[PDB]
Amino acid sequence: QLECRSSAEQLRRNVKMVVEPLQPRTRYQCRLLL
Amino acid sequence: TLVLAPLELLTPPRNFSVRVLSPRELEVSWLPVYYTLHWQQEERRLETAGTHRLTGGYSLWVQAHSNSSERLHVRELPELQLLELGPYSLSLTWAGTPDPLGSLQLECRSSAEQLRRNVKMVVEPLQPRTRYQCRLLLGTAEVYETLG
Ligand SMILES: *[C@@H]1O[C@H](CO)[C@@H](O)[C@H](O)[C@H]1NC(C)=O
Ligand SMILES: *[C@@H]1O[C@H](CO)[C@@H](O)[C@H](O)[C@H]1NC(C)=O
């Protein structure tokens, strides 16, 4: 899985991977979880 | 004379704490013999001290066997009501008990995405015409379909 956490939202996507939707001009820390 | 067999004879609970995890689930934690945990609404035998989970106003005490510790007094969530249904957002509301919680979050999981929002709460952005099961984490899950 790929987890992208921002200051207001956190999205985990089951898995290359496309994370959508995301907020514009927002920083997110993304990591891979096995 | 005759020397006989030398015989061995064997003769509180340090800082017991209670954490409210869920509406039927409490987390007990105590340090140092067995222990007896008593919980009364306003006993369970354990072999070792540490952390345990009590399932199912409450005064709790732990006895080390024999003295006991101090009695700690501690304190169901409502279902999710849809306040606003949109194509890219969902505003939901719940009353809840008036108690302070360290964590209170709303989790909405769809077939392709899962979003957890730190908490009424508005979940945005969401996919249009997508069904998501939303629940409260400190609960029951409610399925809601977004607009198109
Ligand atoms: C049990 O605990 C209390 C409080 O710590 C203490 O005063 C008491 O001496 C203990 N009892 C025994 C028999 O050691
Ligand atoms: C446990 O440790 C000390 C011992 O007095 C106390 O001050 C503290 O509040 C206790 N912690 C919890 C979580 O009960």
CSV table of N, CA and C in Angstrom, one decimal, chain B residues 16-85:
chain,number,residue,atom,x,y,z
B,16,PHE,N,-2.4,1.4,39.4
B,16,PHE,CA,-3.4,0.9,38.5
B,16,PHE,C,-4.1,2.1,37.8
B,17,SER,N,-4.3,1.9,36.5
B,17,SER,CA,-4.8,2.9,35.6
B,17,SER,C,-5.9,2.3,34.7
B,18,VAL,N,-6.9,3.2,34.4
B,18,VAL,CA,-8.0,2.8,33.6
B,18,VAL,C,-8.1,3.7,32.4
B,19,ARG,N,-8.2,3.1,31.2
B,19,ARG,CA,-8.4,3.9,29.9
B,19,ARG,C,-9.7,3.5,29.3
B,20,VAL,N,-10.5,4.4,28.9
B,20,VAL,CA,-11.7,4.2,28.2
B,20,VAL,C,-11.4,4.0,26.7
B,21,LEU,N,-11.4,2.8,26.2
B,21,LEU,CA,-11.1,2.6,24.8
B,21,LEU,C,-12.3,2.7,23.9
B,22,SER,N,-13.4,1.9,24.2
B,22,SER,CA,-14.6,1.9,23.4
B,22,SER,C,-15.8,1.8,24.4
B,23,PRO,N,-17.0,1.9,23.9
B,23,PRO,CA,-18.2,2.0,24.8
B,23,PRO,C,-18.6,0.8,25.5
B,24,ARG,N,-18.0,-0.4,25.2
B,24,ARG,CA,-18.0,-1.5,26.0
B,24,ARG,C,-16.6,-2.1,26.3
B,25,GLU,N,-15.6,-1.3,26.1
B,25,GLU,CA,-14.2,-1.8,26.2
B,25,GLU,C,-13.4,-0.8,27.0
B,26,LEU,N,-12.8,-1.3,28.1
B,26,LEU,CA,-11.9,-0.5,28.9
B,26,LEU,C,-10.5,-1.2,28.9
B,27,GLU,N,-9.5,-0.3,29.1
B,27,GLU,CA,-8.1,-0.8,29.2
B,27,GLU,C,-7.6,-0.6,30.6
B,28,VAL,N,-7.3,-1.7,31.3
B,28,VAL,CA,-6.7,-1.6,32.6
B,28,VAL,C,-5.2,-1.9,32.5
B,29,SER,N,-4.5,-1.2,33.4
B,29,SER,CA,-3.0,-1.3,33.4
B,29,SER,C,-2.5,-1.1,34.8
B,30,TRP,N,-1.8,-2.1,35.3
B,30,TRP,CA,-1.2,-2.0,36.6
B,30,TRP,C,0.1,-2.8,36.7
B,31,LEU,N,0.9,-2.4,37.7
B,31,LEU,CA,2.2,-3.1,37.9
B,31,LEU,C,2.2,-3.8,39.2
B,32,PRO,N,3.2,-4.7,39.5
B,32,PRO,CA,3.3,-5.5,40.7
B,32,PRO,C,3.7,-4.7,41.9
B,33,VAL,N,2.5,-14.3,42.7
B,33,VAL,CA,1.4,-13.6,43.1
B,33,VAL,C,0.4,-13.3,42.0
B,34,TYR,N,-0.9,-13.5,42.2
B,34,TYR,CA,-1.9,-13.3,41.2
B,34,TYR,C,-2.6,-12.0,41.5
B,35,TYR,N,-3.5,-11.7,40.6
B,35,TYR,CA,-4.3,-10.4,40.7
B,35,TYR,C,-5.8,-10.8,40.5
B,36,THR,N,-6.6,-10.0,41.1
B,36,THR,CA,-8.1,-10.1,41.0
B,36,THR,C,-8.6,-8.7,40.6
B,37,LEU,N,-9.3,-8.6,39.5
B,37,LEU,CA,-9.8,-7.3,39.0
B,37,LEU,C,-11.3,-7.2,39.2
B,38,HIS,N,-11.7,-6.2,40.0
B,38,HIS,CA,-13.1,-6.0,40.3
B,38,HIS,C,-13.6,-4.7,39.6
B,39,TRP,N,-14.7,-4.8,38.8
B,39,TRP,CA,-15.3,-3.7,38.2
B,39,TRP,C,-16.8,-3.7,38.5
B,40,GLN,N,-17.3,-2.6,39.0
B,40,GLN,CA,-18.7,-2.5,39.4
B,40,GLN,C,-19.3,-1.3,38.7
B,41,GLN,N,-20.5,-1.5,38.2
B,41,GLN,CA,-21.3,-0.4,37.5
B,41,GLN,C,-21.9,0.5,38.5
B,42,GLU,N,-21.7,1.8,38.3
B,42,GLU,CA,-22.3,2.8,39.2
B,42,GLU,C,-23.8,3.0,39.0
B,43,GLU,N,-15.5,-9.9,39.1
B,43,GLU,CA,-14.0,-10.2,39.4
B,43,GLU,C,-13.4,-11.1,38.4
B,44,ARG,N,-12.2,-10.9,38.0
B,44,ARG,CA,-11.5,-11.7,37.0
B,44,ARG,C,-10.1,-12.0,37.6
B,45,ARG,N,-9.7,-13.3,37.5
B,45,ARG,CA,-8.4,-13.7,38.0
B,45,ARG,C,-7.4,-13.6,36.9
B,46,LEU,N,-6.2,-13.0,37.2
B,46,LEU,CA,-5.1,-12.9,36.2
B,46,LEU,C,-3.8,-13.4,36.9
B,47,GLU,N,-3.0,-14.0,36.1
B,47,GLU,CA,-1.8,-14.6,36.6
B,47,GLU,C,-0.6,-13.6,36.7
B,48,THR,N,-0.6,-12.6,35.9
B,48,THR,CA,0.5,-11.6,35.8
B,48,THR,C,-0.1,-10.2,35.7
B,49,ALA,N,0.7,-9.2,36.2
B,49,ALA,CA,0.4,-7.8,36.1
B,49,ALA,C,0.7,-7.3,34.7
B,50,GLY,N,0.2,-6.1,34.4
B,50,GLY,CA,0.5,-5.5,33.1
B,50,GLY,C,-0.8,-4.8,32.6
B,51,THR,N,-1.0,-5.0,31.3
B,51,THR,CA,-2.2,-4.4,30.6
B,51,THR,C,-3.2,-5.5,30.2
B,52,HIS,N,-4.4,-5.2,30.5
B,52,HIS,CA,-5.5,-6.2,30.1
B,52,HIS,C,-6.7,-5.4,29.6
B,53,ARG,N,-7.6,-6.0,28.9
B,53,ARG,CA,-8.8,-5.4,28.3
B,53,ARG,C,-10.0,-6.0,28.9
B,54,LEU,N,-10.9,-5.1,29.5
B,54,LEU,CA,-12.1,-5.5,30.1
B,54,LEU,C,-13.3,-5.2,29.1
B,55,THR,N,-13.9,-6.3,28.6
B,55,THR,CA,-15.0,-6.1,27.7
B,55,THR,C,-16.4,-6.2,28.4
B,56,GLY,N,-17.4,-5.7,27.7
B,56,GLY,CA,-18.7,-5.7,28.2
B,56,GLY,C,-19.0,-4.5,29.1
B,57,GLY,N,-20.6,5.0,34.4
B,57,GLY,CA,-20.1,4.9,35.7
B,57,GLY,C,-19.6,3.5,36.1
B,58,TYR,N,-18.3,3.4,36.5
B,58,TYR,CA,-17.8,2.1,36.9
B,58,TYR,C,-16.6,2.4,37.8
B,59,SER,N,-16.6,1.7,38.9
B,59,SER,CA,-15.5,1.7,39.9
B,59,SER,C,-14.7,0.4,39.8
B,60,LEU,N,-13.4,0.6,39.6
B,60,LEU,CA,-12.5,-0.5,39.4
B,60,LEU,C,-11.4,-0.6,40.4
B,61,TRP,N,-11.0,-1.8,40.8
B,61,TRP,CA,-10.0,-2.0,41.7
B,61,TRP,C,-9.2,-3.3,41.4
B,62,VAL,N,-8.0,-3.4,41.8
B,62,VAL,CA,-7.1,-4.5,41.5
B,62,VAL,C,-6.5,-5.0,42.9
B,63,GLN,N,-6.7,-6.3,43.2
B,63,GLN,CA,-6.2,-6.8,44.4
B,63,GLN,C,-5.1,-7.8,44.1
B,64,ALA,N,-3.9,-7.6,44.8
B,64,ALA,CA,-2.8,-8.5,44.6
B,64,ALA,C,-2.7,-9.5,45.7
B,65,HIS,N,-2.9,-10.8,45.3
B,65,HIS,CA,-2.9,-11.9,46.3
B,65,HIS,C,-1.7,-12.8,46.1
B,66,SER,N,-3.5,-10.0,51.8
B,66,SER,CA,-3.6,-9.5,50.5
B,66,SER,C,-4.4,-8.1,50.5
B,67,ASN,N,-3.7,-7.1,50.0
B,67,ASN,CA,-4.2,-5.8,49.8
B,67,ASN,C,-4.7,-5.5,48.4
B,68,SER,N,-5.5,-4.5,48.2
B,68,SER,CA,-6.0,-4.0,46.9
B,68,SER,C,-5.5,-2.6,46.7
B,69,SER,N,-5.7,-2.1,45.4
B,69,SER,CA,-5.3,-0.8,45.0
B,69,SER,C,-6.4,0.2,45.3
B,70,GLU,N,-6.2,1.4,44.8
B,70,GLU,CA,-7.3,2.4,44.9
B,70,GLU,C,-8.4,2.2,43.9
B,71,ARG,N,-9.6,2.5,44.3
B,71,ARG,CA,-10.7,2.4,43.4
B,71,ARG,C,-10.8,3.6,42.4
B,72,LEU,N,-10.8,3.3,41.1
B,72,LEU,CA,-10.9,4.4,40.1
B,72,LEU,C,-12.3,4.4,39.5
B,73,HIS,N,-12.9,5.6,39.4
B,73,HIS,CA,-14.2,5.8,38.9
B,73,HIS,C,-14.0,6.4,37.5
B,74,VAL,N,-14.7,5.7,36.5
B,74,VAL,CA,-14.6,6.1,35.1
B,74,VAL,C,-16.0,6.1,34.5
B,75,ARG,N,-16.1,6.7,33.3
B,75,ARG,CA,-17.4,6.7,32.6
B,75,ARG,C,-17.2,6.0,31.2
B,76,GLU,N,-22.6,4.5,25.3
B,76,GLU,CA,-22.7,4.1,23.9
B,76,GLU,C,-22.8,5.4,23.0
B,77,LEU,N,-22.0,5.3,21.9
B,77,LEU,CA,-22.0,6.4,21.0
B,77,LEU,C,-23.2,6.4,20.1
B,78,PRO,N,-23.7,7.6,19.7
B,78,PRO,CA,-24.8,7.6,18.8
B,78,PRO,C,-24.4,7.3,17.3
B,79,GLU,N,-25.4,7.0,16.5
B,79,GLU,CA,-25.2,6.6,15.1
B,79,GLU,C,-24.9,7.9,14.3
B,80,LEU,N,-24.4,7.8,13.1
B,80,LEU,CA,-24.1,8.9,12.3
B,80,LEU,C,-25.3,9.4,11.5
B,81,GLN,N,-25.6,10.7,11.7
B,81,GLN,CA,-26.7,11.3,11.0
B,81,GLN,C,-26.1,12.2,9.9
B,82,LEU,N,-26.7,12.0,8.6
B,82,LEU,CA,-26.2,12.8,7.5
B,82,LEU,C,-26.8,14.2,7.5
B,83,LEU,N,-26.0,15.2,7.7
B,83,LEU,CA,-26.4,16.6,7.7
B,83,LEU,C,-26.5,17.2,6.3
B,84,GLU,N,-25.5,16.8,5.4
B,84,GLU,CA,-25.4,17.3,4.1
B,84,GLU,C,-24.8,16.3,3.2
B,85,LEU,N,-25.4,16.0,2.0
B,85,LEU,CA,-24.9,15.0,1.1
B,85,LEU,C,-24.6,15.8,-0.2
